[PDB]
UniProtKB/Swiss-Prot annotation, chain B:
Protein residues bound to (6R)-L-erythro-5,6,7,8-tetrahydrobiopterin: S36, R286, A367, W368, F381
Tissue and organ distribution: Platelets, placenta, liver and kidney.
Compartment(s) where it occurs, according to its Swiss-Prot or TrEMBL record: Cell membrane; Membrane, Caveola; Cytoplasm, Cytoskeleton; Golgi apparatus
Protein name per UniProt: Nitric oxide synthase 3
Species for this entry: Homo sapiens
Lineage of producing organism: Eukaryota, Metazoa, Chordata, Craniata, Vertebrata
Membrane found in the keyword field: yes
Residues that bind heme b: C105, Y396
Superkingdom classification of source: Eukaryota
Positions that bind Zn(2+): C28, C33
First-to-last residue of the parent protein present: 67 to 480 of 1203
Record's subunit section: Homodimer. Interacts with NOSIP and NOSTRIN. Interacts with HSP90AB1. Forms a complex with ASL, ASS1 and SLC7A1; the complex regulates cell-autonomous L-arginine synthesis and citrulline recycling while channeling extracellular L-arginine to nitric oxide synthesis pathway.
GO biological process, one term: negative regulation of biomineral tissue development
Keyword Cell wall biogenesis/degradation: no
Length: 401, 401
């Protein structure tokens, strides 16, 4: 059992939950690959069996009538159909567990508070679209954001997958330019080109909300424009730098990841978008300051009259902090839920403590948990962490194109 | 079997073929990543052989007369004595390689430029102190710092170790109070109480340079007052925050680590202090702003009239950046070599590309390479890295008590 130390406080725990880590990560005793971004009925049975065990442990019914009955039910379903179906309460529990198990999520103190929309009866991309609109509407909640997941039909033999081709429900277009540059968000050039290829009439702004490309089983993806009133946005301004507003910067309220695969008991839901609310660094540091994203850092620094010709002025660090301030101020001014990196890491520390008492540990990816600015100012920097894969889980999956 | 390594900023891909040589198993398994953890007879011949091979291949003299002949000499030396002595050029080579192989060192672009003082003819702490003093003065060089290592005699059975008890050659004292809390550096309370135990009279200050505890083999440690004119310190002032000087903050010029064991070709050097120059975040972010270190962050923010009542003002971030500005400014004004985290990480990327061409990869500990402020503002943040143990190496070792 790995000993885990907190270096700010000196406290020591042992991550006993790691001994249950099912699927294998990328590291070996020879070499650590922790920094990498991307790391048969009987086996379906044993995964299902383990998850059912988890579920019945959660409802304090381990080794009971209902429990063995369910185990029995699932085996007979797998023998008769090659798969099985989650009860609604198992689906809700499985989606919360997937979030709880997600090692790169710093927002996991909230894991128990997740609204699960069961769209497993979804019949078409049109119906998929309506479920998504209602997810966006519920989660956004006029800026008082609520965490939600909508679970579309599971992967099953004989039919294709439901897929949302967009990486998030709300994403800004990235248009390749006349001089090789990108207008808008360079992370989204690929999905943008797919949208245009699929009949979308592009804009040419920097913050053009993308249409959804929604794929029903064994179907070409179908284009759907999001009702503009469903997409809550936040114009960005800085509390004391009034020129900042003339940047014309915006971000959207709702972070809704739509390209990940939800795995529960060996069942796979390739389409199960989930949303919570932003941590400000995601927007202010990564989305706005990454050189390969909007890349506003130097322009903000020039505007702040910082000395950008020497690194030792820390012009980057100063301009980045003010961009993060602008994000936090703007979302608070718009009354859109947002959490700064200090509050978020502070709640994650309570999560680790809750999880140590609850499960004997907590799978966490230090490199993703530590925020991208002010790392060692947050308490997670000084927390050793054990990274491992537990199921139920959100998994990456290939792009359907 | 050759890890794909991606840079997520430019999109470039390398394969770390050097990882295949990893000797000492690290702490990670396919089951769980422990990458964020701080602290994870004739077998001497197999390491010696490989090291002698490294030396001669590095000088294009593999499979040659001197190579074959040196192989016999070490073979014969171990045969008669059970160990061997490094040739001067080999010791130089091994020290440079151990630095080059240090995965947590961001300044390895400098690995080729290292002054190696050979102290293998040493005995008694008085000789150690002279060697240490020659090192400090050469390394300090009136602020024009020069990388240097002093290699005291190797370990051999029966004979007690040469050990410097201090973690660094320059450390500030840490004093408990009528309330248990620490005056000075809480990182050195242990060695502060040990020096005090060995007949040192404590000061009253927050920046008392500790005395050295030098351990001759099988002899008890011996206190030594460092000559005050040999300990170059930098008073901390801020370029535009006039009141910063009045905080009385100081840091010393020379980061000289004196607790790590140098391993070269199977030989172990428990006393081998190495020094270079500071990266500004080491002082300004970790030493001054860690909560378990000088913990000055709030004091500076109060002086800046920042809103410490809400985390989302990012007062912590703003205060930290100005402390880092004051470190860089103060060292540059004192004309003491220092490097900001942008310059250091940029050079490290250059180092990675060099090592890719030279050796097919580079052991790098992502969590230690990425600086503790403005992580994603540096290129190393977006660079995937592979971490593994190569020899020769700097290794941690137990405290000699
Ligand atoms: C409610 C507030 C939430 C906060 C503050 C939050 C915070 C974060 C942050 C900052 C990341 C880093 C991702 C990146 O840098 O791209 C992340 C990742 C992640 N979050 Fe959370 N999140 C929240 C809600 C949720 C919800 C509701 C779910 C699932 C139901 C979830 C599941 C995940 C997963 C799977 C990742 C992994 C990212 C990846 O591997 O690409 N999060 N979260
Ligand atoms: C010349 C300028 C140098 C710079 C700018 C530099 C920078 C750094 C930094 C920032 C760290 C992080 C460690 C921490 O935060 O505690 C580090 C670690 C390290 N450095 Fe360098 N360093 C330099 C010279 C050297 C030299 C000359 C050697 C050996 C001959 C060396 C060997 C190491 C080792 C072994 C570590 C690992 C520290 C540990 O594991 O605790 N460095 N360096
Ligand atoms: C629900 C939620 C809350 C919140 N606060 N933020 C987010 C966005 C972060 C996020 C991003 C992703 C995409 C990951 N990238 C990695 C780099 N690769 C090149 C492209 C894909 C997946 C998430 F699962 C995820 F959560 C989501
Ligand atoms: C040569 C050089 C250049 C430079 N820029 N910085 C340094 C200091 C970094 C450094 C720090 C350490 C100690 C790290 N932890 C160990 C546990 N302890 C409780 C807290 C501090 C060991 C090094 F071997 C080492 F190198 C050295
Ligand atoms: C190479 C490195 O793994 C990559 O830049 C990671 C580092 N940590 C991260 N952490 C978060 N939260 N999000 C990210 O996208 C990344 N990117
Ligand atoms: C727990 C975590 O690994 C620990 O705080 C590490 C993180 N990264 C670090 N990086 C450097 N350069 N120095 C450190 O002391 C640490 N501490
Ligand atoms: Cl995002
Ligand atoms: Cl230090
Ligand atoms: Gd203003
Ligand atoms: Gd402009
Ligand atoms: Gd004042
Ligand atoms: Zn690992």
């Amino acid at each position: 059992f790995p000993r885990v130390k907190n270096w700010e406080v000196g406290s020591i725990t042992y991550d006993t939950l790691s001994a249950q880590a099912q699927q294998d990560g990328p590291c070996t005793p020879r070499r650590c690959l922790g920094s990498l971004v991307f790391p048969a009925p009987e086996q379906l049975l044993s995964q299902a069996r383990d998850f059912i065990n988890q579920y019945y442990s959660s409802i304090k019914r381990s080794g009971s009538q209902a429990h063995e009955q369910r185990l029995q039910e699932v085996e007979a379903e797998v023998a008769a159909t090659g798969t099985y179906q989650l009860r609604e309460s198992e689906l809700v529990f499985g989606a919360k567990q997937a979030w709880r198990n997600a090692p790169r999520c710093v927002g996991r103190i909230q894991w128990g508070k997740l609204q699960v929309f069961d769209a497993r009866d979804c019949r078409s991309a049109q119906e998929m679209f309506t479920y998504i609109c209602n997810h966006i509407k519920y989660a956004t909640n006029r800026g008082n954001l609520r965490s939600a997941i909508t679970v579309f039909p599971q992967r099953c033999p004989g039919r294709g997958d439901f897929r949302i081709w967009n990486s998030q429900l709300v994403r800004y277009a990235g248009y390749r330019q006349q001089d090789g540059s990108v207008r808008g968000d360079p992370a989204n050039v690929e999905i943008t080109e797919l949208c245009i290829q699929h009949g979308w009439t592009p804009g040419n702004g920097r913050f053009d909300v993308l249409p959804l490309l929604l794929q029903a089983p064994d179907e070409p993806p179908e284009l759907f424009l999001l009702p503009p009133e469903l997409v809550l946005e936040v114009p960005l301004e800085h509390p004391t730098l009034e020129w900042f507003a003339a940047l014309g910067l915006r971000w959207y309220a709702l972070p809704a990841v739509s390209n990940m695969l939800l795995e529960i008991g060996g069942l796979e839901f390739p389409a199960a978008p989930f949303s919570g609310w932003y941590m400000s660094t995601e927007i202010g540091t990564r989305n706005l300051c990454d050189p390969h994203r909007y890349n506003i850092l130097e322009d903000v620094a020039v505007c702040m009259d910082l000395d950008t010709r020497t690194t030792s002025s820390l012009w980057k660090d100063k301009a980045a902090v003010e961009i993060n301030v602008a994000v936090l101020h703007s979302y608070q001014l718009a009354k859109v839920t947002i959490v700064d990196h200090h509050a978020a890491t502070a709640s994650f520390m309570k999560h680790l403590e809750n999880e140590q008492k609850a499960r004997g540990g907590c799978p966490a990816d230090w490199a993703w948990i530590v925020p991208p600015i002010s790392g060692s100012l947050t308490p997670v920097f000084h927390q050793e962490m054990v990274n491992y894969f537990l199921s139920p889980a959100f998994r990456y999956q290939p792009d359907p194109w």
